[model samples]
Target: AMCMPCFTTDHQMARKCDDCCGGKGRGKCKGPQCLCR
Candidate 1:
């Protein structure tokens, strides 16, 4: 996982990850942190 897209947001990075995963990719979005799955 890396920094969210913006690169800075859960949904943002997840969208990118989705492409990479051939469908869906996401991670946890804590109070002050986020990442790609």
Candidate 2:
């Protein structure tokens, strides 16, 4: 799994994991870590 960001509590990434994956992907966030599956 690749760690990437989709959204954050206090910050957002330039490229989200969902958007980055083009909607053909999935993931979960732990604290500030985005785990893409």
Candidate 3:
């Protein structure tokens, strides 16, 4: 699991390092967004 920056509900701000399954053959970050693969 990896933590990455994301936008809140408003999509106007960045949340730093929320719990992510990125870079682990699951969820990944595509540019500034997280994609579940």
Candidate 4:
């Protein structure tokens, strides 16, 4: 998991396991992090 979102405590994780928490495009409340049923 990457750094938590700026607005919320939600953390935007990446598709890959080796993700950088402090890097660009590091975190967001979307993408692979989105909830799926």
Give me the runs in candidate 2 sitting further than 4 Å from their true place.
5-17, 21-25
Candidate 1 residue 24 Cα shift, in angstroms, is 3.2
Q: For candidate 4, lDDT tens digit of each residue in 1-37?
A: 4233232343333432224344445444444342221
Q: How accurate is candidate 2 locally (lDDT)?
A: 0.52
Candidates sorted by lDDT, best first: 2, 1, 3, 4
**Candidate 1, poorest ten consecutive residues by summed lDDT:** 2-11
lDDT of 1 at 9: 42
**Cα error, candidate 2, residue 7 (Å):** 6.2
Using all chains and alpha carbons, the TM-scores for the candidates as numbered come to: 0.32, 0.35, 0.32, 0.21
Question: Relative to the unseen true structure, what is the C-alpha lDDT of residue 15 in candidate 1, on a scale of 0 to 100?
Answer: 59
> Over the stretch 1-37, how does candidate 2's per-residue lDDT look in tens digits?
4466445653544346555545545545555566665
Worst 10 residues of 2 by lDDT: 6-15
| Residue 17 accuracy (lDDT) in model 4 | 20
Total clashes in model 4, counting residue pairs 3 or more apart in sequence or in different chains: 0
* Candidate 4 lowest-lDDT run of ten: 11-20
Runs in model 3 with CA error above 4 Å? 1-23
